[PDB]
Structure formats: C-alpha cells, structure tokens
Amino acid sequence: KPPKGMFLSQEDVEAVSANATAATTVLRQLDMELVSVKRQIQNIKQTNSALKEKLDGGIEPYRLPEVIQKCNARWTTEEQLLAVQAIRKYGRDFQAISDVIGNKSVVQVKNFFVNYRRRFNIDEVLQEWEA
Amino acid sequence: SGVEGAAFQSRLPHDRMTSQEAACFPDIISGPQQTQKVFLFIRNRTLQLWLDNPKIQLTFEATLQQLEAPYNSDTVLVHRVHSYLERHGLINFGIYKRIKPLPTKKTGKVIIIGSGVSGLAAARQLQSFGMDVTLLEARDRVGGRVATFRKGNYVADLGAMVVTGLGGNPMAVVSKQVNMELAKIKQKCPLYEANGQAVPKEKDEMVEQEFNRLLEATSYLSHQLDFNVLNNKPVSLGQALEVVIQLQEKHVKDEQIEHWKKIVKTQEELKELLNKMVNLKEKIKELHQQYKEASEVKPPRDITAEFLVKSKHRDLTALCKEYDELAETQGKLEEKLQELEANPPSDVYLSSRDRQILDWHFANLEFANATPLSTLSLKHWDQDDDFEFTGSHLTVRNGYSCVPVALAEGLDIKLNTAVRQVRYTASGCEVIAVNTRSTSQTFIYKCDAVLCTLPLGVLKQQPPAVQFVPPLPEWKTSAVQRMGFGNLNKVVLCFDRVFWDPSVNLFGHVGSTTASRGELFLFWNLYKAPILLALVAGEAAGIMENISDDVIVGRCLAILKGIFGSSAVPQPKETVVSRWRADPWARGSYSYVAAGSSGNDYDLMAQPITPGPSIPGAPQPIPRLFFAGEHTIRNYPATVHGALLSGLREAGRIADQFLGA
Ligand SMILES: Cc1cc2nc3c(=O)[nH]c(=O)nc-3n(C[C@H](O)[C@H](O)[C@H](O)COP(=O)(O)OP(=O)(O)OC[C@H]3O[C@@H](n4cnc5c(N)ncnc54)[C@H](O)[C@@H]3O)c2cc1C
Ligand SMILES: Cc1ccc(-c2ncc(OCC3CCNCC3)cc2-c2ccc(C#N)cc2)cc1
C-alpha cells in the first residue's frame, strides 16, 4: 500500500538506514556500477562496429543463380550414379540428395533407397559415411 | 439536520453519549436505550437553541418552554442536561447578555495567571458561575499570543490570524457575538524563484504533487513498516522524508542499471551473431572458390567430377541459406537496440531547480507547524488532524484583538503583573507577583485555587521564570520537557499603494538553499489598507531574530523588487517585525508534537496538581493548581479555539470542585 511511483521495500529501508553514511554509500555504489556498465556497452559497440565492417559486401559475390528443374521420375544411369555418391557424402539426408541430383523429389529418393538397396550396396555405402 | 447539526457544531456525536456525559449521567448510559435517545435529543435540542442565538443567555426556564412533548415531561432530566451543558461551557459561553444579573454573593477565590484566550475564557465562566476571579497578566495588554498591530489606517495581526474552518469551531459562536469580519483565502500561490521569474505551471504542479506523495510515503513508512525508532532514538518526520527521498533516488538509479543491462545483453547477442556471420562468410567465400574451380573442369567429365560441381553447388546454397537467416536475425536484433536507445528511463529523480521548489513546500509545512521538520514526531505529528473543522480557512480582516478585548469586558485584570512564585498547600494558595514596570513592588495574592495558563515556552524556561512551591511533580515537568514548543515570525510591510496582484492573496519566494528555505518564503495580502505580511518559518525562524529590523526589511524589499521590479516597490511607511521566541512572555509561538512525545503528553499538562496534607494523617486534600492553554488540549493544540476550549474546560472543572456539580 505505498503511493503510486513511491518505492519503499522493507529491505531497502534497512539498507539505507543501517549506518550513518549508508545511503550515500548505497547511491554512490550504484553510480559506480552504472558507469562500468556504460563502458561495457561502448566496448561492445566498437567490437560490433568492427565486425559489421567485415561483412561489408554481403555474400552477394557468392550467391549462385537459382536454377529450377522440372522434376522427372525417370532415373538415368547418370542420375543413379549421383545418388550413390550423394549417399556416400550426405547419409540419410533426403533433402540434400534431392538437391544434388536436381530433378528427383524427396520421396523418389527415399524410394530409390529401398529400391536400389540390394544392388548398390547401399548398406555398405551408409557404413562408409560414418567414418 | 438541525438538531443533528447542533451536535456536530458542538464537536459531539449526535447518536451516542460521550465519556464525559457517561460520567455525569451514569444512570442513563447504563440504562435502557430508549431513555438514552430522550437524553440525546434533549442535549442536542438545547445545544441547537443556544447555537441558534448565542447573544442571549439560554436559561433552563427558556429551554423547557421550547421543548415539545414528551421531552418536556421529565423536567428534572431537562434540568440536569441544561446544567451539564452550562457547566462544561457548551452553552452560555463567550459574550452574551445575561437575563439573570450576576448574584452579588461571590463564592471561592481563583487567581488566573495570564489573560491569553484560555485564561480569559476560564475567567468569564468562573465569574458566570459566581466565583471571585482575578487575572494576573505580565504584559500591558490582554490577548497573549493574539496581538494586533494598529497604527493609523493600518491593522495587522502579529499573532493568530486564521480561523481553521467554522464547522465545529467554537470561534464560530464567538464571531456571532463579537461581529468580527472574516474573509476567505484564495488558494492560488504563484512561486517565484530567487531570480524573480515565476515557476511555470507544469512544474509547480509536478512538484506539489510530488511533495504530497512524499508525505503519504512517510505515513506508510510510519504505520505499515513500523519505522518509528532508529538507533534508540525516535524517528522524526524530517528523517523519514530524507529516507523516502533517498529511496526514490535509489530506485531511479536502479531503473537505469536495469535498462542499460538490457542493452549489453542484446549487444552481446549481436556480438555472437556477427561472429557467426563473419565465420560463415569466410566459409562461404572459400566454398564458392571451390565450386568455381570444379565448374571450370570443362566437360565431358566423368561422374565423380560431375558430382563435385553439383555437390559443391548444393553445399554452397545451403550455407547461403544459413547466412540469409542470420542476417534477418540481425535485422530484428539491431532494431531492438534502436528501441532501447530511444526509451531511456528518467535521468534524475529531482533536479536542483526541482528540489528547491520542493524545499518551498517543506518550508510551507514547517510554517504551519511552527517548527523544523527534523523535530516533528514521525509517529504522532499529524494526530490532531482527525479533528479538522469543516469549511474554508478564514482570516480576521479587522484584527484578531477584537476577541480577547471583548472577552476582558467586566473582568478584574491586573496588567503589568509578572507572577514569580506559585505557592499551593492544603489550606489554599499564594501567588507572588511583581510590577513589570518596577520589579521592586511585590504583590501577594491569596486564593482558593490557581489556574495556570503560562505558555509552554514559559514553563520550559531554564532558569525558571516562575517557581512553584512545592515543585511540580516529575510526571508534569517531564512532559513539559518532552513536548515541543516551536516558533514562526512575521514582517508587517505597510505601503501607501498596492503594487502586487490584488486578486491574489498569496505568493511565494523560493529559497536557493535547503537551509534558507524558511527565510521570507511567503507573502500575504489580506487587509483593506495596502499591507503585505512576510512569513518566516523553520530553521530560519530562530536565526532571523538575531538580525536587525532594517536588514530584514531590506531582504524583503530585495525579494519584492526582484519579483515586481525596482521601479515599482516604494519604501514602507511603517514596518513591524515579530520576534516571538525572544518574547519573554511567550518563549516561542505554539506547541508541536515533538519526536519522542505524543498526545498523551498534552493530557498530562492538563492534569491538575493536588498538594499533600498540611498535618500528617489528614484526609486527602483537594486539587489546588490547575492548567489551561493551547498546550493542554490534545485534539486542538496550538490554536485559539484549542485555548478557548481549554479555558472552558478548567472553569468547569474548578467550579465542580469548589461549588459542587
Ligand atoms: C505567531 C502566531 C500565530 C498564530 N496564529 C494562529 C492562527 O492563525 N490561528 C490559531 O487558531 N492559532 C494561532 N496561533 C496560536 C494561538 O494564538 C495560541 O495557541 C493561543 O492564542 C494562546 O493562548 P493561551 O491563552 O493558551 O496563551 P497566551 O495567549 O500565550 O496567554 C498566556 C498569557 O500569560 C502571560 N504571562 C506569561 N508569563 C507570565 C507571568 N510570569 N506572569 C503573568 N502573566 C504571564 C502572557 O503574557 C500571556 O498573556 C498563533 C500563535 C502564534 C505565536
Ligand atoms: C496561508 C496559510 C493559511 C493557513 C495556514 C494554517 N493552517 C493550519 C494551521 O493549523 C494549526 C496547526 C497547529 C499545529 N498542528 C497542526 C495544525 C495553522 C495555519 C497558520 C495560519 C497562520 C499562521 C501565522 N502567522 C500560522 C499558521 C497556514 C498558512
């Protein structure tokens, strides 16, 4: 029941009155705590300002153009060979493999897994990925 | 209602009997509830008839003819009530025409020290009751701390000046009798800082409300946090305010640290994000170069070489997707920082300009309490507030002296008679006094009873101005030391022409330091002839007294010339400066509930003193030494009305002793 915007904890009252010089010590202490936080800000602002200058250039010299490829259901000997190497490199990553081949949906790839499981030693290939 | 209003105007509950009524009518309060109402109606109706016309004595015969049935059937009941009210001064008090001329057979002898209002009121009653009453007054005038300066057209009260509402105030009754002229006070009070420019509205209100908040803060601090003792000494209203303020200054700094700590937290997230993007960009840059080299192994290539291009391409657009996500995260972090950088909490709790205007409101409080706030009891300083009268505070335009003078008509007053010694014994009392003009002339006054209205300042004096033989008991002296007797002063400035704002009764001067805050802090227009009063409060009160009149009027004209211009403030035709603490018949202004004291101390003061038996083994003597005055009335100290009531009281008490009830 204090008035609005007044701030009077039983804890703070005892902390200010416990000693003859206590309130000035409480208040000057907070002062010297706010001064050290403000220079911590300054330090981070300048550390950050240095990082932003390294990102000048974005990644735009490095983005490739986004080729779209109409998905096809026919597996070429070429596209099969990509799939093995993709399993060799990426493991169970059905999205990545779909991306590398370019024209095979994620489903077709998981289908490719069991379909050609026996013939391409796809069990052995997945073992080699775990090196 | 009108019958109910009479009770309220008599400071009485209308539907209940009081403790004092219980004492005189214990058959009725312990009796059935019906007779209680009959009693209560008779009491209220008798009060009403008196209140409805206080210029004529309301006799018992008159009261009975005016009651309607069935209330006029128990005439003995009516007679008890009427005599009760008369004795305790609830009816037929102040200045009325008597129907019955006073009986020449006078009974008992009473010496009253002081003809302040308390002394005067008691005297008039005791005379009405048929006793022999003589007043001894040290000054050359009546009125005590009611003291009106008069010179030519100029009239200005150096003492009491305000009627603190008429609703329930006995001075409302008096003013009908004395036809004194009362006037309201316009509440607008422009404050001018020491530079003479005014305080703008935005800030006057911002601070007044902050001041009102800080007060309530101490009361919460007092009642809810039991913060009334600190290092074995009683906490003062001053210390509480200082603690409250420190806590607001603490909380302002707390908010700043919380706010800037939200910024480091966010800046440090940004730091880690940027680090992730810089290491991601370098990893992307390297990868792109690899794809570029693989993409330049011109076909026809075997399938591992085709895998490498398609592989690197995949790896690369994946990392570019990662980077784009991180930079959208960087957008929403960098704007949260623009957010916090644009809502910084309050910079300071109060500025030096602010804290000075705050000091003005403190001085204003120091003024009406007539003491530095460091000396007011935190726990009990506002205790008399539960009994505020209702209605507007008024000033006495024609001079408050009109009252104590009118009261003195017909009384035997010995002016220029300073009491030196009060002797009280089983057989009676001796008051020794001297002529103030020629202290070698000595006077002995023998009396049945002595009523003391010596100011609390005077009782406080060391070494004593008045010696009691035998010495007042410890329980009385210790209350005398405990209580606070304070101090305020005025400077009367009489000009020949009004240069201030006439539609404005008050304006302020803001002191430049906490210490000087009481020094000429308020200027008051209220009289017909062009007169400004200038008030001095707080720690400034005592200090200004050791400064010459001419310097004080200098400081005044200096402040005024700063406000209205040098070209517009003429020299005063006449000036007066009160110095109430140095006045030897006052020794200060009025009482205040000092820290370490309470309102119970005010009661102790009113307790009469009973001497011990002359001969040993002799029956219990009756009380001989009685006490009135503003320091003797718990619920209404430090006022004229409180003094008046206190005198009414003692007169009733003395008459009950020496005439029988
Ligand atoms: C500056 C000032 C302003 C005030 N303004 C207001 C106001 O606006 N409203 C309000 O309600 N109250 C006000 N008061 C308070 C009010 O005036 C007093 O409470 C009251 O009037 C005092 O009356 P009293 O009869 O108790 O004592 P006093 O009037 O002080 O009377 C005591 C008498 O005893 C005399 N005396 C002292 N020593 C001796 C001695 N040794 N021998 C003989 N006689 C002696 C004194 O000279 C005096 O006449 C003010 C007080 C002061 C000081
Ligand atoms: C403009 C203005 C108007 C009124 C008051 C005021 N209000 C209320 C008062 O209550 C009496 C107090 C007695 C001590 N316990 C608290 C109540 C007194 C005073 C007062 C009035 C005049 C003088 C003088 N000279 C001194 C004080 C002040 C300024």
Author numbering:
A (entry chain B): 309 to 439
B (entry chain A): 172 to 832
Sentences from the paper on this structure:
Lysine-specific demethylase 1 (LSD1, also known as KDM1A) was the first histone demethylase to be reported, and its discovery proved that histone lysine methylation is a dynamic process regulated by methyltransferases and demethylases. LSD1 demethylates mono- and dimethylated Lys4 of histone H3 (H3Lys4), using flavin adenine dinucleotide (FAD) as a coenzyme. However, LSD1 is unique in that its catalytic domain contains an elongated Tower domain where the REST corepressor 1 protein (CoREST) binds and presumably mediates LSD1 binding to a nucleosome. LSD1 is highly expressed in several cancers and is involved in maintaining the stem cell properties of cancer cells, such as those involved in acute myeloid leukemia (AML) and glioblastoma.
In this paper, we present the crystal structure of LSD1•CoREST in complex with 4-[5-(piperidin-4-ylmethoxy)-2-(p-tolyl)pyridin-3-yl]benzonitrile (1), which was recently reported to be a reversible LSD1 inhibitor with a Ki of 29 nM. Crystals of LSD1•CoREST in complex with 1 were obtained by the soaking method. The crystal structure, which clearly reveals the electron density of 1, shows that each of the three branches extending from the central pyridine ring of 1 is anchored to a separate binding pocket in the spacious substrate-binding cavity of LSD1. The piperidine ring of 1 is located in a negatively charged pocket formed by the side chains of Asn540 and Asp555 and the main-chain carbonyl groups of surrounding residues (including Ala539 and Ala809). The 4-methylphenyl group resides in a rather large hydrophobic pocket in the LSD1 substrate-binding cavity. The 4-cyanophenyl group sits in a hydrophobic pocket formed by Met332, Val333, Phe538, Lys661, Leu659, and Tyr761 and is located near the FAD molecule, with the cyano group nitrogen atom 3.9 Å from the closest atom (C6) of the isoalloxazine ring. Specifically, the side chain of Trp695 changes its conformation to accommodate the 4-methylphenyl group of 1. Although the docking study indicated that the piperidine interacts with Asp555, as was observed in our crystal structure, the pyridine ring in the in silico study was rotated by about 180° relative to its position in the crystal structure, with its nitrogen on the FAD side of the pyridine ring.
